[PDB]
Amino acid sequence: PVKIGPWGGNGGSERDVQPKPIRMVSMTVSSGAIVDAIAFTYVGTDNVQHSSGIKWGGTGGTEDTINLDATNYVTEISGTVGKFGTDDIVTSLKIITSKGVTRTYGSGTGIPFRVPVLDGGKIAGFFGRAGAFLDAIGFYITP
Amino acid sequence: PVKIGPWGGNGGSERDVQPKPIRMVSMTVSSGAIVDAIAFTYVGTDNVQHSSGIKWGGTGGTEDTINLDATNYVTEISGTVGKFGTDDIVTSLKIITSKGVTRTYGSGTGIPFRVPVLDGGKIAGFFGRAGAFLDAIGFYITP
Numbered sequence: 001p002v003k004i005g006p007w008g009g010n011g012g013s014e015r016d017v018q019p020k021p022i023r024m025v026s027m028t029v030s031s032g033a034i035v036d037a038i039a040f041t042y043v044g045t046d047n048v049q050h051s052s053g054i055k056w057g058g059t060g061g062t063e064d065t066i067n068l069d070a071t072n073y074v075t076e077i078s079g080t081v082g083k084f085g086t087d088d089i090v091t092s093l094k095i096i097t098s099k100g101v102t103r104t105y106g107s108g109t110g111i112p113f114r115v116p117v118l119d120g121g122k123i124a125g126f127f128g129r130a131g132a133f134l135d136a137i138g139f140y141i142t143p
Numbered sequence: 144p145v146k147i148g149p150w151g152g153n154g155g156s157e158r159d160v161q162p163k164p165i166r167m168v169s170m171t172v173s174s175g176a177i178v179d180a181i182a183f184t185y186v187g188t189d190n191v192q193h194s195s196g197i198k199w200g201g202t203g204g205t206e207d208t209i210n211l212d213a214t215n216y217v218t219e220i221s222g223t224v225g226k227f228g229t230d231d232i233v234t235s236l237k238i239i240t241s242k243g244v245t246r247t248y249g250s251g252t253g254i255p256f257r258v259p260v261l262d263g264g265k266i267a268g269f270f271g272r273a274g275a276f277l278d279a280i281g282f283y284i285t286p
């Protein structure tokens with residue numbers, strides 16, 4: 001995959017997956033006022049299915065899961081980076097799939113970021129930073 | 144390549160290349176107060192070298208060319224989208240290469256965008272919108 005990002009603040013602890021993802025199977029976002037945590041399931045470059053492990057971020061918010069397949073894949077993610085308390089974090093995220101559904105996580109504000117993937121490309125997974133919340137998010141993308 | 148973006152306003156006319164780029168050979172940005180135009184040279188998916196054609200945007204600004212090769216490639220582009228007159232355009236662009244040189248085009252402000260490419264990935268080319276100026280910029284990226 002291509003690896004781009006992340007978007008967000010410098011706090012929390014680094015997060016990534018080994019091996020790198022080639023296809024995302026599911027993703028789970030934990031959120032409330034802002035984005036608390038993220039987790040996902042993927043097929044790696046080893047052609048095996050993996051978990052990203054325990055979620056990246058705290059125990060706050062509520063979980064929501066998106067299940068992906070050959071015709072239902074993530075084509076756009078956008079969001080905002082702003083304060084929640086003293087830290088710059090991911091204060092909102094919006095996920096758009098190839099079947100035209102939008103999910104929105106968080107209700108926060110700040111500086112917008114947007115990654116529209118065109119021509120059949122798709123988000124294959126995530127990396128970033130997280131502590132109590134999701135400080136920063138980055139993407140693995142396949143054409 | 145992966146195709147992502149664009150970042151900018153809805154004005155000007157659509158711009159793209161056929162065939163799609165797999166490797167960027169050079170890029171030329173025209174700029175003054177803001178970004179006036181962009182052009183580049185690339186190797187296509189047809190494994191031939193191509194021009195992007197006449198520049199995308201107006202006759203304003205001054206040209207600056209970056210020449211790329213196997214060890215000197217674009218690893219990050221950032222910029223801002225803001226007003227110049229009545230239109231939202233690309234008011235600044237910053238290009239960073241694998242040899243650690245930064246070029247900055249434009250002196251404008253507005254909403255920032257940033258695409259850091261990690262792990263040896265690189266910008267392979269551009270698409271977007273342009274009229275008198277560079278209304279919007281998007282990127283082709285290879286891992």
Ligand SMILES: CO[C@H]1O[C@H](CO)[C@@H](O)[C@H](O)[C@@H]1O
Nearest residue numbers: 031032033034035036060061
């Ligand atoms: C403000 O409190 C709410 O938002 C935070 C941040 O999203 C969550 O951790 C918490 O559980 C609540 O839902």
Ligand SMILES: CO[C@H]1O[C@H](CO)[C@@H](O)[C@H](O)[C@@H]1O
Nearest residue numbers: 011012087130131132133135
């Ligand atoms: C509450 O502090 C923790 O959480 C914030 C937000 O995630 C991080 O910035 C910080 O480094 C800690 O990990």
Ligand SMILES: CO[C@H]1O[C@H](CO)[C@@H](O)[C@H](O)[C@@H]1O
Nearest residue numbers: 174175176177178179203204
């Ligand atoms: C404000 O005028 C300057 O900036 C504009 C926009 O970049 C250019 O077109 C022009 O030639 C000048 O350099």
Ligand SMILES: CO[C@H]1O[C@H](CO)[C@@H](O)[C@H](O)[C@@H]1O
Nearest residue numbers: 154155230273274275276278
């Ligand atoms: C001056 O008007 C032209 O240039 C601006 C800026 O590029 C475009 O938005 C617009 O559509 C026209 O093409």
